[PDB]
Amino acid sequence: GNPGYWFAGDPVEHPDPAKPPIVFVHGLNGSSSAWFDENDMAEQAWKNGYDAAFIDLHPDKDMQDNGAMLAAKLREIYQYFGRKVILVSYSKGGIDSQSALIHHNAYHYVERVITLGTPHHGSQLADLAYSNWAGWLADILGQKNDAVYSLQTGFMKSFRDQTDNHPNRLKTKYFTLAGNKIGGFGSALFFGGVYLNMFGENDGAVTEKNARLPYATNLDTGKWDHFSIIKGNLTFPVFMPLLTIQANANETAALSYPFIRGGENHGLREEEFAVEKGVKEITVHWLSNHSSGNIKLTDPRGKPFKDFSIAKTADVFEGGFVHSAAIKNPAAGTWKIASSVKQKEAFLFIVTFDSPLNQQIKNAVTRESSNLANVKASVRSIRYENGKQAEKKSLKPASINALQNSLSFKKAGMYSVTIDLSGKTADNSPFNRTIIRSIYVNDKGEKFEN
């Protein structure tokens, strides 16, 4: 779009004081066109007697720059309509919205805020994008910018801390909508969905728990994915009562691990991975900057599998491709993925596991005793300062007892820590998992991790 630009939708013949105008706020890497492309949201607002306005904010800037701009334009929108407006904000737009109201005093112009699939607690996919293994892919996709950076869960934990108890927070009512539908096998939100399934219910880009605010009316999750949640015909009738109702705050009712690798491939790249005994399912993903690579997955017996679907990546990983597969009851042992390319590729290889081993992993990394044997942990980390990489580290494998000591977070900045775990299960089969931690450390040395 054109950051700063806004326009009014068709005028309602008879406006109603009971119906404030709606300002529609797009999300990450978007513009006001999100409300019109294969979408009837403007028509939904108009036909239901609502005046509306649509704004272009920065597709690639943080909630501070977007909050300052939105706050400045909300003054013009308020002057144009002659009254307080409602914000209907999608994805990162819900965060820019809060920043505008709380940190840029836009609450004067706004009656209420409704957020649709907003990662108020951050995006685990943004944590992934900023992690060591994702380095090569994130670079050529150009997915590292101030907006994606501000979506890391560590950064959002700190934003939550600075926002939720700010005096301006109480001056506006909040409503949140979240989806629980992921992308179908072969579609753009399949990878995001199965990745986020390791954390919980999600819409392919944001988890239901991370789409909520503690003092908001958190509406029960709907059957929307991250793309369908903004379709006018689907959600305008759903949030239409939320445009006027006086509601109270409510809470919604209450972890698996992947295996991850990344790098560059100029021809043939093979990555081995252990699949322990008793795995119900594995999802296997090869993310690349191009779609023409030949993917071959070989089982422990050498039997190949080439039944991979191809899909574009979305949101945080917009601009790339993903080859995916789902294997029911995979044979235990060493599997191997192979990518054969004619053109240079940066890749991110991810395996998710549906396995009872998750409980044991959680026990081994926490204080608890586990039935896991010969456990090793190798640490790879990146520390960022003001959106730029400041320091990158790699540490040789060591035992779990040494893992806590090796992890220092004294310096201010955004940290991404990749912990690669290996060892044996109780039935002697090797296993492998990769844990990604997102930590923000402020000027006082206070650590923020979700």
State the CATH number of the domain containing residue 265: 2.60.120.380
Instruction: Output the DSSP codes for 132-153.
Output: GGGHHHHHHHT--SHHHHTTSH
> Considering the domain boundaries, does residue 130 fall inside one?
no
Q: Name the residue type at position 427.
A: D
Measured torsion, CA atoms of residues 88, 91, 92, 95, in degrees rounded to the nearest 10: 50
Determine if residue 405 is left, alpha or beta; phi over 0 gives left, psi from -120 to 50 gives alpha, anything else beta: alpha
Q: Are residues 68 and 111 in the same domain?
A: yes
Work out the widest C-alpha separation in the chain, in whole angstroms: 73
Report helix, strand or coil for 243: helix
Question: Residue 16 CB: number of other CB atoms within 10 A?
Answer: 11
Q: Are residues 389 and 320 in the same domain?
A: no
Q: Are residues 287 and 420 in the same domain?
A: no
d(CA 173, CA 111): 7
237: tokens are 């009738």
Instruction: Output the DSSP codes for 363-423.
Output: HHHSSS--S-EEEEEEEEEEEEETTEEEEEEE---EEHHHHHHH----SSEEEEEEEEEEE
The answer to whether residues 26 and 63 touch, using CB atoms and an 8 Å cutoff, is: no
- Last-in-domain residue among 354, 373, 405: 354
Q: Are residues 300 and 348 in the same domain?
A: yes
d(CA 339, CA 288): 10
Q: Are residues 375 and 332 in the same domain?
A: no
Q: Are residues 77 and 33 in the same domain?
A: yes
- Phi first, then psi, for residue 448 (nearest 5°) are -120, 115
Q: Are residues 179 and 64 in the same domain?
A: yes
Helix (H) / strand (E) containing 334: strand 333-340
Q: Are residues 323 and 442 in the same domain?
A: no
Spell out the alpha helix ranges (H) of 9-62. 41-47
d(CA 198, CA 296): 24
> Considering the domain boundaries, does residue 136 fall inside one?
no
Spell out the alpha helix ranges (H) of 82-212. 93-98, 124-129, 135-141, 146-149, 153-163, 190-196
d(CA 353, CA 252): 26
DSSP one-letter code for 426: T
- Last-in-domain residue among 354, 388, 415: 354
Nearest to 314 by CA among 231, 186, 229, 227: 227
> Considering the domain boundaries, does residue 306 fall inside one?
yes
Q: Are residues 102 and 155 in the same domain?
A: yes
Helix (H) / strand (E) containing 347: strand 345-354
> Considering the domain boundaries, does residue 375 fall inside one?
yes
> Considering the domain boundaries, does residue 1 fall inside one?
no
Q: Are residues 363 and 347 in the same domain?
A: no
Q: Name the residue type at position 59.
A: P
Q: What share of the chain is helix, strand, coil (3-state, %, to 5)?
A: 30, 30, 40
Q: Resolution of the coordinates in A?
A: 2.0
> Considering the domain boundaries, does residue 251 fall inside one?
no
d(CA 239, CA 234): 10
Question: Residue 246 CB: number of other CB atoms within 10 A?
Answer: 6
Q: Are residues 348 and 364 in the same domain?
A: no
Q: Name the residue type at position 114.
A: I
- Last-in-domain residue among 183, 212, 243: 243
d(CA 299, CA 294): 17
Kindly report the CA angle at 43 between 73 and 230, in degrees rounded to 5?
A: 70
> Considering the domain boundaries, does residue 132 fall inside one?
no
What's the length of the chain? 450
DSSP one-letter code for 202: B
Experimental method: X-ray
Report helix, strand or coil for 1: coil
> Considering the domain boundaries, does residue 249 fall inside one?
no
270: tokens are 């093979």
d(CA 81, CA 85): 8
State the total domains in the chain: 3
Determine if residue 244 is left, alpha or beta; phi over 0 gives left, psi from -120 to 50 gives alpha, anything else beta: alpha
Question: Residue 304 CB: number of other CB atoms within 10 A?
Answer: 11
Domain residue limits at 386: 356-450
CATH number at residue 72: 3.40.50.1820
Which residue reads 């649709």 in tokens? 116
Q: Are residues 239 and 260 in the same domain?
A: no
Beta strands in 178-226 (DSSP E): 217-218
Report helix, strand or coil for 38: coil
